[PDB]
Amino acid sequence: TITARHTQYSHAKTGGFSQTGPTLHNPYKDDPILDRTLRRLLPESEYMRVAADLSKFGDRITSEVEHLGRQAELEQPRLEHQDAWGKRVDKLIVCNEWHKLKQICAEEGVISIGYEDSVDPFVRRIHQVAKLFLFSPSAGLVSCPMAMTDGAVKTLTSLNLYGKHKLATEAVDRLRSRDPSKAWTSGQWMTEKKGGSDVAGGCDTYAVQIDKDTYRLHGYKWFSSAVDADVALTLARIVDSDGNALEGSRGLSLFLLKIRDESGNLNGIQMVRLKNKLGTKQLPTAELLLDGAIAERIGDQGRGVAGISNMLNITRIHNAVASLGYMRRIISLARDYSTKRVVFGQTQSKWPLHTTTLAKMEVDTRGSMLLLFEAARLLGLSEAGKSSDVEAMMLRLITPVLKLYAGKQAVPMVSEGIECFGGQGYMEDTGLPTLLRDAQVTPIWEGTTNVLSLDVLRVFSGKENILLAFGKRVEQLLGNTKTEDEKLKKSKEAVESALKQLQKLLVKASDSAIQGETRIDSVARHIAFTIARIYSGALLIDHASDSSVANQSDIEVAYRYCCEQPLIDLRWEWFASERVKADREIVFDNFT
Amino acid sequence: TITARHTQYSHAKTGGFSQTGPTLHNPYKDDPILDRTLRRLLPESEYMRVAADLSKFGDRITSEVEHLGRQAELEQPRLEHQDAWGKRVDKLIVCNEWHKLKQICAEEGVISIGYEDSVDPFVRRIHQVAKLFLFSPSAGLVSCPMAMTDGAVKTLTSLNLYGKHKLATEAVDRLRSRDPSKAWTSGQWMTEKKGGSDVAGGCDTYAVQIDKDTYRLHGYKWFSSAVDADVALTLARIVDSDGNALEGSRGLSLFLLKIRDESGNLNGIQMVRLKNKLGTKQLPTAELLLDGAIAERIGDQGRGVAGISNMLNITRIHNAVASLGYMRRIISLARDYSTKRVVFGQTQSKWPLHTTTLAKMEVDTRGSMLLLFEAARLLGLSEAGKSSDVEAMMLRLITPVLKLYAGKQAVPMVSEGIECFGGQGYMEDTGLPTLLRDAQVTPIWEGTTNVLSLDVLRVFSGKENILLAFGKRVEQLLGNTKTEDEKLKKSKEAVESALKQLQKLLVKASDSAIQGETRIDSVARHIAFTIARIYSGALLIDHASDSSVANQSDIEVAYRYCCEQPLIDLRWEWFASERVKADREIVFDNFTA
Amino acid sequence: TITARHTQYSHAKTGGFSQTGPTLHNPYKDDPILDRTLRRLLPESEYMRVAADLSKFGDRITSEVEHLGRQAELEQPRLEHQDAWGKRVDKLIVCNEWH
Ligand SMILES: CCCCCCCCCCC(=O)SCCNC(=O)CCNC(=O)[C@H](O)C(C)(C)COP(=O)(O)OP(=O)(O)OC[C@H]1O[C@@H](n2cnc3c(N)ncnc32)[C@H](O)[C@@H]1OP(=O)(O)O
Ligand SMILES: CCCCCCCCCCC(=O)SCCNC(=O)CCNC(=O)[C@H](O)C(C)(C)COP(=O)(O)OP(=O)(O)OC[C@H]1O[C@@H](n2cnc3c(N)ncnc32)[C@H](O)[C@@H]1OP(=O)(O)O
Ligand SMILES: Cc1cc2nc3c(=O)[nH]c(=O)nc-3n(C[C@H](O)[C@H](O)[C@H](O)COP(=O)(O)OP(=O)(O)OC[C@H]3O[C@@H](n4cnc5c(N)ncnc54)[C@H](O)[C@@H]3O)c2cc1C
Ligand SMILES: Cc1cc2nc3c(=O)[nH]c(=O)nc-3n(C[C@H](O)[C@H](O)[C@H](O)COP(=O)(O)OP(=O)(O)OC[C@H]3O[C@@H](n4cnc5c(N)ncnc54)[C@H](O)[C@@H]3O)c2cc1C
């Protein structure tokens, strides 16, 4: 008999402390302003229906969707070119959770709700955009195929193809389907190696006619996301009976195709590789080599850029939803964590420096959230056939302004947000860095900040009616100000003074006399930013001025937004042609 | 015989175009302001020696170091707890290129230059800081152990241990060695699960006396970077003969230890795991369980935090170097790409909106760069015993202001830079996203933005009149303004105005304290940023005013920095305690409690 | 207008041959001696019940189980000692197909 050795088997001791991490609360109920915004925008009976759907979905997010989106990051997509026996197969391997998320989008009507024929288009885009906002930061980038799917439905519908074109009619029905066994998603293959931003210049895919409006496509698609989708829209140059094609925009035609044939093989397509991306790693983005891909021409020949133009309001809107969802999500988690993390003897929530940093993030977020809902409201009105001329013009203006502004807010805000967790915010296993890496896609794809800033200029150039309409919309918003509150009065005076200074600069910039020494393109971003802030400020004031829903937070936020940061940051001397040569000397000093 | 089948074997055709990526040029030669700045700060003689070293190193960066740093990201460190036969070994597997980078740091005197006895201290810190600035964005995060190594040397020499204390003396000699076969690196183990910002409340490591000043450590280190290092400094609570210890800052003492013993075995340490990090993936960062780690107490008992202060400050300057390194790198790469990428029929570089966006990044980067070199200057003067009272105060003030400000500039600026490449900027296999992921460490470690803003306030709280001193420094810089250039006159009046307004605000805040309705802590970041911008502007003006080296871009940059952004953004009402209540109501609206 | 470039986009040609791999047949039906052996060992009555079960299972093997077993090799188990917040959890991660 021996001494027993049970004392020689002992788990490590590590002090017994471990920090509780942030909790994700139902994102409908927890959101500072979503429910109040919906209450103002929708009729009470619709509001009750919408809020009940959204609240229930918010519990699905916490109980199910968040975990699924996390798995889709943990088990990233792979591609196998060949099987084991020497046959080219292009096998895409995607986790089960990616598929489950797609199914959930169908069941929840993330597309459907936007087009439901029995609901007022006004109401349905507001409901839809709200639902998309709850989904996005938990979606594992299923948000991307939802965006392109909504885009596709919009494009095919606007081209008057429904009940006229067989493939387009099946696509619309299936893209809109709530049955997860039948529903489809769409991709959008526009970006090529020579350009993305510039498709008229960069697109080098050719379409050879097979029969009537059926063509075979030959080209190289440089970024093609959601290659597990069912159909795609793309652009190509039709080749004439002489073997020739046209350069530029008027050479481009729009096509619809199925990605895989009846037996699940790729339709004239090879996946050259999957991209290795900073973020959106959940999402399969491939390079595609098209060699004989069978596709149907849709819309008029030479008018493919106009054809895809139908989609820009709604794609721009989904991308802003995503920027805002990451901004809201980091704030939501950071404020929760602030109540559980003790530093210097009390929780972070109690240190005024901490709440000062978060309060400013909340102010800026709220602004752009209202801008988002203004865009949703305008889109719905346009789809109901109920827009005033001012509302139709604000739909064209707001979509690029919203996208670029929220896109440019997103990374610095998320970056600030992760720092609220200290070193933990930098740890991938927390899930927090995903928010930053994924938010960084938002100012880049579907147009960069600067490309969209130029689009804004184009919306209005030179024709002063867009700016006069913007002026009328702001005036409508400020007309409801509760000027008996000194903060809201000051806020309104600040918005008016910014809009007047904007209008004076743009009139002065358009003076025929000074075309030679003026470069409005140079200050495009400044111009777009100033629109965004004036518009968002006027919306915050209106919101705060509605006694039936506003609280004291709403007034203070309107005040801070309007009065504690510049609404306009734009000086006449920045328009000068000479300023450019000085910018170039700054940038290229000692360049080799 | 058959028809031959050569036509049936054929590579894919893919259109024939592909885009040329950006080129990294010699970063000393290609830098907009580094060489001009060294010409001004250094004596003419030292200038030549220093610039030849840096220029040569720049070719080493492009020819060798960059590729090495890239490799260290592609083959990240791994940890194996056990061998195959049931023995716990804690084997850290790091790529050959990580090791090669450390060797190059020794050979190149990235540490040594800062301490070389034959060279004037003011010169050598300028030289050292410039060299670190060239190294940092290609370093594969070898910059991190270089920071900690420099901080360790400073700490150990400041405590007057060199020539007295056995381990500290060996450590100093090895940490400074240019011999890659002998050189050492250090770590710094402060952060624990309960707190990193707050080590007084967070630290739960205990030190049990073995003999005289040698102790056994027992604790859990929650973040320990560069666990391939040879030594580390750490804090622990000394246990008295009754088995008790003191809570709070006053219970902490400083310790120096060897990470591995003479057999290469861990010294009472187990590596629990490696962190899985957003960036700095090149760097091995572990959690450490200390159970009987042998360590030597240094400095006075109870004054560990004060003892470790030189490490915090040196590492905070290195961290600013890294922030600025990422900012300059992205701008260098983006500007080169602009000459090669055609969009809408011409190169990005020809489009005014593209140059407006980059020009602003350049203006902001130059200001922080001059602040960095003013910190290097002030550090050198302090180490030479040549600091005026004002220069000593400005060293203590500038260190956290610089770190936190460049820190907070870095992610938005590198984000803007990656967008210049469009979708390609988001592709990991370009190397560009690394710059963003890595730059994101810089506002977090060695003190968050806010925590350092609070250190700025600790600076004002001792003390002597830090604000007066700051006003004196700014006026030195502004005297010799070339008021004869209209843009520089305007720039000067902008800085004076911002300084006068800050002084005024801070005077009101001291006056109102005892009422109990003022919370200067609430606005600590706004105060810190105003200091950064005032100081940076005045430096830019002084730089542009020097007609011996300044070019036209230097004047235009000073003007834009000073007159086209607010230098001060701070209002009296932000100090009020009633505003905190409003902040909470904004932040916690609908919070699920 | 330009010469079209469709001929410049073209999949690789690799000769046109590839070898067919082996086929897994119903392992009850395809086995050389299993069914003959069960016929001898089991009473005639039990034989029928047992062979129908096994034969049906054999089609389940070829249609379902084989692929599942293959997947369990392609996605091998993993162990995570700690969660992201310093708690020891010993989380075993096994593929859905194992379950
Ligand atoms: C975060 C997760 C979920 C949220 C989002 C998920 C998104 C998935 C990401 C997939 C992609 O990145 S797909 C690749 C997208 N590619 C782009 O976005 C390219 C960006 N470039 C531009 O926007 C350019 O400015 C172009 C393409 C519009 C320039 O084209 P053109 O060179 O043909 O320029 P034009 O000005 O000639 O435009 C041609 C026509 O198109 C019209 N058009 C152009 N833009 C618009 C618009 N926004 N609205 C209405 N119409 C528009 C324009 O009015 C004009 O019509 P007409 O004047 O002939 O009637
Ligand atoms: C990118 C490549 C570039 C390379 C950079 C690589 C970095 C490697 C990463 C490693 C880390 O993150 S290591 C852990 C970093 N941890 C921190 O930075 C700590 C953050 N927290 C603080 O700074 C806090 O303010 C405290 C820890 C220093 C709080 O300490 P206490 O609670 O003891 O606060 P006290 O104010 O009582 O400080 C105690 C004494 O220490 C003094 N002290 C505190 N801070 C300083 C300082 N910065 N300089 C001089 N003295 C200082 C203070 O004046 C005082 O002196 P006396 O009045 O007693 O004489
Ligand atoms: C993760 C990911 C997935 C994607 N998936 C898809 C997809 O499924 N389908 C698809 O079609 N595309 C996709 N894209 C591509 C995306 O739409 C392009 O990256 C984007 O349109 C930018 O184009 P580019 O990459 O060609 O950038 P470029 O145009 O080469 O470079 C952009 C830079 O050039 C500047 N620039 C461009 N034009 C001008 C101008 N006129 N004036 C001043 N500056 C200008 C921009 O401002 C920016 O600084 C994806 C991209 C990413 C990152
Ligand atoms: C890659 C990486 C490597 C690291 N390597 C090392 C290493 O080798 N050695 C080491 O010692 N440390 C290391 N760290 C840790 C680092 O120093 C800490 O993460 C950092 O100091 C923040 O402390 P924390 O993580 O405890 O965050 P916390 O202090 O828990 O939280 C930070 C947040 O709390 C706020 N906060 C804290 N105090 C206050 C206050 N008084 N008032 C208002 N707000 C406050 C901050 O502003 C920020 O918003 C590393 C970190 C990382 C990310």
Over A37-76, what HEC string results?
A: HHHHHCCHHHHHHHHHHHHHHHHHHHHHHHHHHHHHHHCC
Of the candidates B7, B17, A194, which has an alpha carbon nearest to the alpha carbon of residue C12?
B7
Q: Whose CA is nearest to atom 13 of ligand 3?
A: A223
CB nearest to A243's CB, from C3, C20, C96: C3
B480 CA → ligand 4 middle, Å: 42
Beta strands B206-211 and B214-225: pairing type?
A: antiparallel
* Torsion angles phi and psi, residue A568, rounded to 5: -115, 130
**A587/B355 touch (CB, cutoff 8 Å), yes or no:** yes
Element (H, E) at B295: strand B285-298
DSSP string computed for A527-557: HHHHHHHHHHHHHHHHHHT-TTT--HHHHHH
Cβ–Cβ pairs < 8 A, chains A and C: 73
Closest residue to C4, CB basis, from A239, A270, A429: A239
Most C-contacting residue of B3, B6, B11, B194 (CB-CB within 10 A), to test interface: B11
- Does the CB atom of residue A551 touch ligand 1 within 6 A? no
Closest by CA to A369, choosing from A415, A332, A340, is A332
**Contact by Cβ (8 Å): B568, B502:** yes
Question: What angle in degrees, to the nearest 10, is found between the helix axes of A524-544 and B352-383?
Answer: 90
Mutate to test the pocket of ligand 4, among A331, A338, A348, A414 (most ligand atoms within 8 A of CB): A348
Task: Give CA B58 to chain center in angstroms.
Answer: 20
Sign of CA dihedral A122, A128, A131, A136: negative
Ligand 4: residue whose CA is nearest its atom 11: B190
CA-based nearest residue to A128, from A101, A147, A145: A147
How many Å apart are CA B152 and CA C4, to the nearest integer?
Answer: 66
Burial B316-343 (b: 16+ CB within 10 A, else e): bbbbbbbbbbbbbbbbbbbbbbbeebeb
C-alpha A183 to ligand 2 mean position (Å): 57
Half-sphere exposure for B294 (CA within 13 Å, toward CB):
12
Contact residues on chain A for C11, CB-CB shorter than 8 A: 270, 289, 291
- CATH 1.20.140.10 is the classification of domain A33-33+35-42+310-449: yes
Q: Is A440 assigned a ligand-binding role in the annotation?
A: no
Using a CB–CB cutoff of 8 Å, tell me whether C7 touches chain B.
Answer: yes
Is A578 annotated to bind a ligand? Reply is no
- Smallest Cβ distance to C9: which of A87, A88, A220? A220
Experimental method: X-ray
Return the structure tokens found at B89.
Answer: 């070994």
Alpha helices in A205-274 (DSSP H): none
Residues B346, B347, B348, B349: is their CA dihedral positive or negative? Answer: negative
Q: Which residues pair with A343 in a beta bridge?
A: A346
Bridge partners (DSSP) listed for residue B255: B234, B297
Q: How far apart are the first and last CA of chain C?
A: 61
Query: Preceding residues of all breaks in chain C (C to N beyond 2.5 angstroms)?
Result: none
Q: Read out DSSP for A172-209?
A: HHHHT---TTT---EEEE---SS-SS-HHHH---EEEE
Please state, in angstroms and as integers, the Cα–Cα distance from residue A354 to each residue in A271, A358, A362, B20, B450, following that order.
48, 6, 13, 45, 8
Q: With an 8 Å Cβ cutoff, are B586 and A219 in contact?
A: no
3-state secondary structure (DSSP) of residue B465:
coil
Q: How far is Cα A538 from Cα A367, in angstroms, rounded to an integer?
A: 9
Query: A336 to chain B nearest CA, in Å?
Result: 8
The residues pairing with A294 across neighbouring beta strands, listed in sequence order, are A216
Sequence letter at residue B156:
L
User: Alpha-carbon distance B552 to B294, whole Å?
Assistant: 59
Asked if B557 has any chain A CB less than 8 Å from its own CB, the reply is yes
Backbone angles phi, psi at B218, to 5 degrees: -135, 115
Do the beta carbons of residue A140 and residue A437 sit within 8 Å?
A: no
C-beta atoms of C15 and B9 within 8 A: yes
The answer, for B8 touching chain C at a CB cutoff of 8 Å, is yes
User: Residue whose CA is closest, atom 33 of ligand 1?
Assistant: A249
Classified as helix, coil or strand, C61 is helix
- DSSP reduced 3-state for B86: coil
| Phi, psi dihedrals of residue B390, rounded to the nearest 5° | -70, -40
Burial of A332: CB neighbours in 10 Å, binned 0-12, 13-18, 19+: buried
Rounded to an integer, what distance in angstroms lies between the CA atom of residue A47 and that of residue A120? 12
Residue B196, SS3? coil
Closest CA to A572 of A527, A532, A536, A516: A527
Asked if residues B212 and B201 have their Cβ atoms less than 8 Å apart, the reply is: no
The rounded radius of gyration (Å) of the Cα atoms in chain A is 26
For chain C, list the contacting chains (3+ Cβ pairs, <8 Å).
A, B
Out of C8, C14, C81, name the one closest to residue B9 (CB): C14
User: Given the structure tokens 């770190």, which residue do they identify?
Assistant: B403
Contacts 24+ apart (CB under 8 A), A552-556: A552/B582, A552/B585, A553/A32, A553/B585, A553/B586, A553/B589, A554/A33, A554/A36, A555/A485, A555/A487, A555/A488, A556/A487, A556/B582, A556/B585, A556/B586
- List phi, psi (to 5°) of B220: -125, 115
A497-A498-A503 Cα angle (round to 5): 100
Q: Give the containing element (helix H, strand E) for B581.
A: helix B577-587
**Mutate which: C8, C85, C88, C91, vs B, most B CBs within 10 A:** C8
Closest CA to A483 of A471, A475, A498, A493: A493
Q: Are the beta carbons of B227 and B187 closer than 8 angstroms?
A: yes
In one-letter notation, the amino acid at residue A523 is V
Q: Is B318 left (phi over 0), alpha (psi -120 to 50) or beta?
A: alpha
Q: How far apart are CA B134 and CA B119, in angstroms?
A: 21
- Is A273 annotated as ligand-binding? no
Classify burial at B512, counting beta carbons within 10 Å of its beta carbon; exposed 0-12, middle 13-18, buried 19 or more. Answer: middle
SS3 B108: coil
Cβ count within 10 A of residue A50: 25
Ligand 2 mean position, distance from CA B254 (Å):
13
With H, G, I as helix, E, B as strand and everything else as coil, classify residue B185. Answer: coil
Cβ-in-10-Å burial (0-12, 13-18, 19+) of B574 comes to middle
Q: Are B361 and B327 in contact (CB under 8 A)?
A: yes
H or E element that contains B275 = none
- Best probe of the C interface among A11, A18, A341, by most C CBs < 10 A, is A18
Torsion over CA: B169, B174, B178, B181 (sign):
positive
Q: Is B548 annotated as a binding residue?
A: no
Max CA separation in chain A (angstroms): 109
Closest CA to A189 of A236, A153, A156: A236
Q: Which positions ≥6 away from C73 have C-beta within 8 Å? A: none
Residue the block writes with tokens 């000086």 = A571
- Does any CB of chain B come closer than 8 Å to the CB of residue C86? yes
Q: Enumerate residues lining ligand 3, CB below 6 A.
A: A 187-191, 195-197, 223-225, 277, 280, 285, 441, 444-446, 448, 450-451, 454; B 341, 343-344, 348, 351, 353-354, 419-420, 422-424, 426
Element (H, E) at A289: strand A285-298
- Beta bridge pairs of residue B218: B206, B291
Q: How many CB pairs under 8 A join A and B?
A: 271
Cβ contact (<8 Å) for A204 and C20? no
With a 6 A CB cut-off, is B271 part of the ligand 2 pocket?
A: no
Instruction: Select from B71, B79, B129 the least CA-distant residue to B95.
Output: B71
What's the CA gap between C69 and C27, in Å, rounded? 15
Label residue B464 left, alpha or beta by phi (over 0 means left) and psi (-120 to 50 means alpha): beta
Any idea what DSSP says for residue B277?
A: B
Q: Find out whether B329 and B22 touch, Cβ atoms under 8 Å.
A: no
What span, in angstroms and rounded, lies between the C-alpha atoms of A297 and A257?
9
Spatial neighbors of A122 by CB under 8 A, at least 6 apart, are A377, A380, A381, A383, A384, A386
Q: Phi/psi of residue A584, each to 5°?
A: -65, -35
Cβ contacts of B500 within 8 Å, gap of 6 or more: none
Q: For tokens 């080799």, what's the residue?
A: A592
Burial of A9 (0-12, 13-18, 19+ CB in 10 A): exposed
Is residue B498 within 8 Å of B562, Cβ to Cβ? no
Contacts of A23 in chain B (CB under 8 A): 592
Tell me if chain B has a CB within 8 Å of the CB of A9: no
Distance CA(B453)–CA(B524), nearest Å, equals 5
Calpha distance B233→B145 (Å, rounded): 12
Which pair of tokens denotes residue B536? 């940076």
Largest CA distance in chain C: 85
In A325-442, which ranges are E strands? 342-343, 346-347
> Considering every ligand atom, which ligand is closest to the CA of A344?
4
